[PDB]
Amino acid sequence: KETIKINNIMIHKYTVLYTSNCIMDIYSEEEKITCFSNRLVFLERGVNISVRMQKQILSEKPYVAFRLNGDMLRHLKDALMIIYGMSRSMSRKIMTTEVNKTLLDELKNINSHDNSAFISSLIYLISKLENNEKIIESIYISSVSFFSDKVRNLIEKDLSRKWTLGIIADAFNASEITIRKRLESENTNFNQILMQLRMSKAALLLLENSYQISQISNMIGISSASYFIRIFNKHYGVTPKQFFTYFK
Amino acid sequence: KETIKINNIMIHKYTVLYTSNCIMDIYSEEEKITCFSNRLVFLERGVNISVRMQKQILSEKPYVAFRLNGDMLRHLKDALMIIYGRSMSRKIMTTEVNKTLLDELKNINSHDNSAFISSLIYLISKLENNEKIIESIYISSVSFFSDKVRNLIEKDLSRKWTLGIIADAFNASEITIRKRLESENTNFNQILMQLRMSKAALLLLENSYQISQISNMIGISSASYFIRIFNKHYGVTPKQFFTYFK
Numbered sequence: 001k002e003t004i005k006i007n008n009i010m011i012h013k014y015t016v017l018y019t020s021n022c023i024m025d026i027y028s029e030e031e032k033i034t035c036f037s038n039r040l041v042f043l044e045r046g047v048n049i050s051v052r053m054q055k056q057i058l059s060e061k062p063y064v065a066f067r068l069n070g071d072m073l074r075h076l077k078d079a080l081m082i083i084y085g086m087s088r089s090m091s092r093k094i095m096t097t098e099v100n101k102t103l104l105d106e107l108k109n110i111n112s113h114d115n116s117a118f119i120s121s122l123i124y125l126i127s128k129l130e131n132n133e134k135i136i137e138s139i140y141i142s143s144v145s146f147f148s149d150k151v152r153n154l155i156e157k158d159l160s161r162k163w164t165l166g167i168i169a170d171a172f173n174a175s176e177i178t179i180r181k182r183l184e185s186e187n188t189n190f191n192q193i194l195m196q197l198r199m200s201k202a203a204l205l206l207l208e209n210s211y212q213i214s215q216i217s218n219m220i221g222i223s224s225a226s227y228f229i230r231i232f233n234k235h236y237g238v239t240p241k242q243f244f245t246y247f248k
Numbered sequence: 249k250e251t252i253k254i255n256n257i258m259i260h261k262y263t264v265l266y267t268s269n270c271i272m273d274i275y276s277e278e279e280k281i282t283c284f285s286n287r288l289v290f291l292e293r294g295v296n297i298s299v300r301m302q303k304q305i306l307s308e309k310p311y312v313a314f315r316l317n318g319d320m321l322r323h324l325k326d327a328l329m330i331i332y333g334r335s336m337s338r339k340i341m342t343t344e345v346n347k348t349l350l351d352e353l354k355n356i357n358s359h360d361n362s363a364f365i366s367s368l369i370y371l372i373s374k375l376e377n378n379e380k381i382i383e384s385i386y387i388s389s390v391s392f393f394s395d396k397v398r399n400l401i402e403k404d405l406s407r408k409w410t411l412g413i414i415a416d417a418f419n420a421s422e423i424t425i426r427k428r429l430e431s432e433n434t435n436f437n438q439i440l441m442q443l444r445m446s447k448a449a450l451l452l453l454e455n456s457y458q459i460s461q462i463s464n465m466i467g468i469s470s471a472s473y474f475i476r477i478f479n480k481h482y483g484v485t486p487k488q489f490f491t492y493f494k
């Protein structure tokens with residue numbers, strides 16, 4: 001089957017996706033968005049979504065994706081609040097567009113080496129999109145640091161340690177209630193943050209195609225490679241082997 | 249004869265010039281740059297240059313020019329020093345505009361200022377040896393005392409200005425102001441003459457004001473006197489200037 005359903009995908013970096021040969025339904029919050037043959041998808045950081053996906057060509061990769069790390073996105077926010085001025089709807093969180101001739105050829109000669117060239121390519125592209133406010137919005141919203149973000153970074157400093165709400169609540173000078181309700185006010189909780197951190201790191205590493213599963217288990221902090229396969233399958237709704245075979 | 253010599257052109261706004269159909273020799277300071285057919289020219293604000301320029305097709309305009317006012321240049325400076333972190337070769341720069349970047353310049357509609365700053369930033373991103381430009385955009389984006397003097401003069405171009413009026417406006421003595429302007433390699437009569445003569449050139453290109461109106465507007469009694477001053481300064485008469493650029 002050239003179709004795959006992947007669950008609980010949480011986007012940890014602002015992501016721009018280009019459906020190189022796939023078609024995709026994005027569910028997330030009891031909603032749904034379709035992304036057709038040749039479109040661009042701008043995914044706000046922090047969303048949690050599920051995906052149903054159709055390959056066009058079976059022998060090829062599903063899509064092509066660009067992810068903006070924390071710095072780059074801070075910069076894009078600043079430059080955007082200089083170029084346009086300074087100032088809850090899943091349709092204001094995930095946006096598809098029709099990639100034009102000039103915007104496409106621009107996407108061609110994008111070499112993600114000169115980071116400034118990338119920020120500029122991205123700004124010019126943003127300038128050449130209609131109804132573009134809703135994208136500007138999602139880039140500033142997802143460009144602020146939340147408390148779940150402080151927790152996320154403290155966990156990433158050593159992904160494999162055995163974390164508890166007790167260690168985070170010691171790190172931050174407050175009690176476990178403080179942390180469970182601040183994280184609850186962000187529509188998440190700590191066991192889920194840890195789970196999302198390990199499962200994304202595992203997916204990406206599995207796509208690198210140069211690590212045994214047991215190593216990836218160890219890298220994210222999971223004893224058994226078979227135990228890791230169970231957790232991955234339960235979370236994403238596919239086994240690492242099928243995920244890998246669909247994405248290679 | 250479709251070649252023209254224009255002297256003492258003083259750039260009050262960061263200028264990007266595209267020799268749409270002309271060839272041009274630029275004399276900054278005892279130095280010289282030639283700009284071939286289809287090139288871009290980045291002119292640092294505050295430079296004073298002289299130009300000898302030859303049209304390709306005569307029934308058309310010489311070039312196409314973009315001038316960035318203070319707001320826009322401040323926004324460009326800020327945005328540029330977020331995205332990236334005395335030499336007439338760092339003040340006037342010509343480059344080769346590629347095919348694709350040329351089409352980019354085409355679909356430039358200077359209405360959405362955000363779209364224009366974006367087009368400008370993408371262009372700057374697509375230039376080799378472009379460091380020399382970012383510097384000149386920051387170099388020319390700070391406020392000098394000649395600038396404070398310029399803004400006071402521009403608030404009412406037609407008054408009869410002297411050093412005495414400026415030295416009362418700013419709390420200092422005429423020596424203070426002549427020497428603060430001196431360390432900027434200018435003087436007040438030059439500042440005033442350059443405002444009036446630039447404003448006169450631009451207005452003459454607008455094709456909608458009698459010469460007497462332009463004279464009256466810049467602060468010059470006579471229209472025949474203004475024509476004399478213009479010819480003496482620019483090296484052409486307003487009529488020859490207009491007929492060359494229309």
Ligand SMILES: CCCCCCCCCC(=O)O
Nearest residue numbers: 009010011012013051200203
């Ligand atoms: C779009 C379907 C692919 C599965 C998602 C892989 C990891 C999500 C990316 C991220 O963590 O930033």
Ligand SMILES: CCCCCCCCCC(=O)O
Nearest residue numbers: 257258259260261299446449
């Ligand atoms: C190279 C073309 C120059 C001819 C006209 C110059 C008048 C503009 C003066 C200015 O921008 O401050």
